Amino acid sequence: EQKRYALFLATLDSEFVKKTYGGYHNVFVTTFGDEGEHWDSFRVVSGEFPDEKDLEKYDGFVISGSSHDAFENDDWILKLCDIVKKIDEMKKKILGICFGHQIIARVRGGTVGRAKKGPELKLGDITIVKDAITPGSYFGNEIPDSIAIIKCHQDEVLVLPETAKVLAYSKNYEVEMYSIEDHLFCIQGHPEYNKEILFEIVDRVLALGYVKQEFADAAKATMENRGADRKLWETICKNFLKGRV
Ligand SMILES: N[C@@H](CCC(=O)O)C(=O)O
Numbered sequence: 256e257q258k259r260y261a262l263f264l265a266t267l268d269s270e271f272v273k274k275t276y277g278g279y280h281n282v283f284v285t286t287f288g289d290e291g292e293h294w295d296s297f298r299v300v301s302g303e304f305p306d307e308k309d310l311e312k313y314d315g316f317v318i319s320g321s322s323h324d325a326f327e328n329d330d331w332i333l334k335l336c337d338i339v340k341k342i343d344e345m346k347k348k349i350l351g352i353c354f355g356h357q358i359i360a361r362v363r364g365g366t367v368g369r370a371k372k373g374p375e376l377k378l379g380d381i382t383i384v385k386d387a388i389t390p391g392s393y394f395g396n397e398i399p400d401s402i403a404i405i406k407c408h409q410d411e412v413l414v415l416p417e418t419a420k421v422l423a424y425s426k427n428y429e430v431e432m433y434s435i436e437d438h439l440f441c442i443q444g445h446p447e448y449n450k451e452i453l454f455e456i457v458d459r460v461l462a463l464g465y466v467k468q469e470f471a472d473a474a475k476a477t478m479e480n481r482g483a484d485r486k487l488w489e490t491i492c493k494n495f496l497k498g499r500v
Pocket residue numbers: 319320321322323324325352353354355407408409410411
């Protein structure tokens with residue numbers, strides 16, 4: 256039977272991502288896709304959504320990052336939350352990345368907002384709560400203590416739903432990864448990003464005057480000699496999304 260996955264693109268394609276990869280559809284399919292699957296994307300930020308009656312044919316959903324705030328009330332955000340509520344009640348798998356981690360927390364009664372400790376734009380590390388993970392489950396036989404991931408956000412989950420289990424934290428952000436039941440799995444960082452994408456964002460927000468030159472240089476310094484644990488993230492996220500265990 257055919258495997259199908261829906262990608263909710265809550266961002267437009269940046270110039271760099273369009274030119275280098277052909278857009279975020281491709282970025283996500285490169286990261287999370289395997290040969291033979293059908294991926295349909297929906298530019299939810301532009302108000303484009305799957306039909307409600309077509310949700311059953313998908314084996315899983317991915318919600319992308321966004322430059323919008325997950326606590327805002329734009330009509331497409333409201334419609335996204337309503338559709339996520341429906342998919343959630345169907346017990347369909349949803350992987351939420353950054354904005355999508357936030358949206359799922361919102362749907363489940365949590366609070367998202369500006370992070371108490373400020374924004375991040377860097378490669379960083381997250382600490383795994385190993386007493387929340389089964390050896391041989393979607394985290395691997397041997398769970399690492401720490402995982403490197405690209406961070407690019409100004410908001411965080413300020414109040415976590417009661418139904419969520421924290422799977423990872425960092426010194427400055429209590430909720431770096433969490434799960435709800437068996438079918439919701441959320442990561443604050445961007446496993447689909449790479450150094451090129453990050454460095455292009457840094458350069459652009461510096462040029463806009465949003466950050467200082469010294470902040471931009473500190474941000475890039477974090478990836479001068481190390482990258483994220485990309486292979487590890489692909490394995491984790493695919494294990495989750497496709498029920499591979
Ligand atoms: N705008 C949200 C989401 C960021 C993202 O998904 O890249 C934040 O800054 O936290």
